[PDB]
Amino acid sequence: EASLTGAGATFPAPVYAKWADTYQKETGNKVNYQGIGSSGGVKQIIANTVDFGASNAPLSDEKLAQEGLFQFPTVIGGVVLAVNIPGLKSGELVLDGKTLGDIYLGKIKKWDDEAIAKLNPGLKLPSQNIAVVRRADGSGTSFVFTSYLAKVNEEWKNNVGTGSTVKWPIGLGGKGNDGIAAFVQRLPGAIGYVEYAYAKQNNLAYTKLISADGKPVSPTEENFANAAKGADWSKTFAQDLTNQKGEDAWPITSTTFILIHKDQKKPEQGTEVLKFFDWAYKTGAKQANDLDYASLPDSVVEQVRAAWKTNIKDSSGKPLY
Numbered sequence: 332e333a334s335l336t337g338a339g340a341t342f343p344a345p346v347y348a349k350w351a352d353t354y355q356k357e358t359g360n361k362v363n364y365q366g367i368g369s370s371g372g373v374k375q376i377i378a379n380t381v382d383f384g385a386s387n388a389p390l391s392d393e394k395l396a397q398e399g400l401f402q403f404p405t406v407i408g409g410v411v412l413a414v415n416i417p418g419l420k421s422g423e424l425v426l427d428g429k430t431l432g433d434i435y436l437g438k439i440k441k442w443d444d445e446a447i448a449k450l451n452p453g454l455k456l457p458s459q460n461i462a463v464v465r466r467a468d469g470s471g472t473s474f475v476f477t478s479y480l481a482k483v484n485e486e487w488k489n490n491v492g493t494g495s496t497v498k499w500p501i502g503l504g505g506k507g508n509d510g511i512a513a514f515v516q517r518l519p520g521a522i523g524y525v526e527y528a529y530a531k532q533n534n535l536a537y538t539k540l541i542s543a544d545g546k547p548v549s550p551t552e553e554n555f556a557n558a559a560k561g562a563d564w565s566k567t568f569a570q571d572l573t574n575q576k577g578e579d580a581w582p583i584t585s586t587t588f589i590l591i592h593k594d595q596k597k598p599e600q601g602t603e604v605l606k607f608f609d610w611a612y613k614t615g616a617k618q619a620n621d622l623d624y625a626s627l628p629d630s631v632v633e634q635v636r637a638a639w640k641t642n643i644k645d646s647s648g649k650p651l652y
């Protein structure tokens with residue numbers, strides 16, 4: 332039995348926690364995962380203070396090479412807009428990218444603003460003031476989110492751009508996905524981006540978004556998987572899944588990566604890390620699904636296994652898988 336430590340992204344925290352828990356029940360191995368945001372997860376794996384790092388934002392091949400890291404995807408989730416609009420229930424408000432962008436730019440200030448009303452014909456929006464919530468900490472969820480907004484709102488692209496941290500035009504800061512969920516819950520008029528599980532687990536109402544193809548879609552597990560149907564994984568794991576074309580493709584979708592050193596100094600920790608993720612691919616699909624994360628197609632996991640053999644070694648050049 333081994334004791335492993337991981338750290339990083341809160342985006343997959345719910346599933347990683349479940350996997351760890353079940354893994355310890357079934358094998359005795361203990362995986363201690365710390366959700367500190369993707370930014371911290373990357374700083375940590377590089378500082379060698381954990382056995383594996385987790386970031387929703389991929390590292391470039393060059394940067395991976397410069398640090399001696401290897402990254403691989405685990406699950407596919409989706410970022411939803413959680414809201415607290417006295418009167419409205421979940422799934423009923425509809426927004427489109429441009430508008431979502433203007434709300435985060437501080438251009439739209441009330442729920443019954445023309446722009447929103449035009450998008451929700453039958454809705455009776457209250458004239459509540461919108462309280463914008465964004466991440467206070469360095470976030471891979473903030474990266475997927477700002478990557479999507481840059482694609483759908485020109486002013487957002489030119490003035491604040493994309494990033495794990497950016498200069499937010501407006502909004503209160505919340506720490507971690509859980510931080511943002513707690514804020515929306517305590518603030519009438521609140522809107523904040525969170526990975527889907529956090530909205531659902533906390534009974535927070537969310538909106539539908541307009542797909543790249545122009546149709547309103549609900550955030551669900553299968554729609555997260557839809558956004559990924561056209562992803563050419565054979566080309567690379569670092570797949571951008573935001574605003575993808577296709578029927579029922581949720582627009583703010585993202586996979587999430589695990590970062591490990593190619594030259595394993597503590598080969599016993601390395602091996603156990605791989606064994607844990609292998610068990611997760613082989614058996615944790617149900618647990619992921621229960622949590623509304625879409626599993627990666629088998630072809631991709633086979634690619635990940637092949638890569639492990641190819642890239643992960645002890646200092647003797649001996650493969651750990």
Ligand SMILES: O=P([O-])(O)O
Pocket residue numbers: 339340341342343367368369370386387469470471472473507508
């Ligand atoms: O998953 P996050 O914590 O990096 O946003």
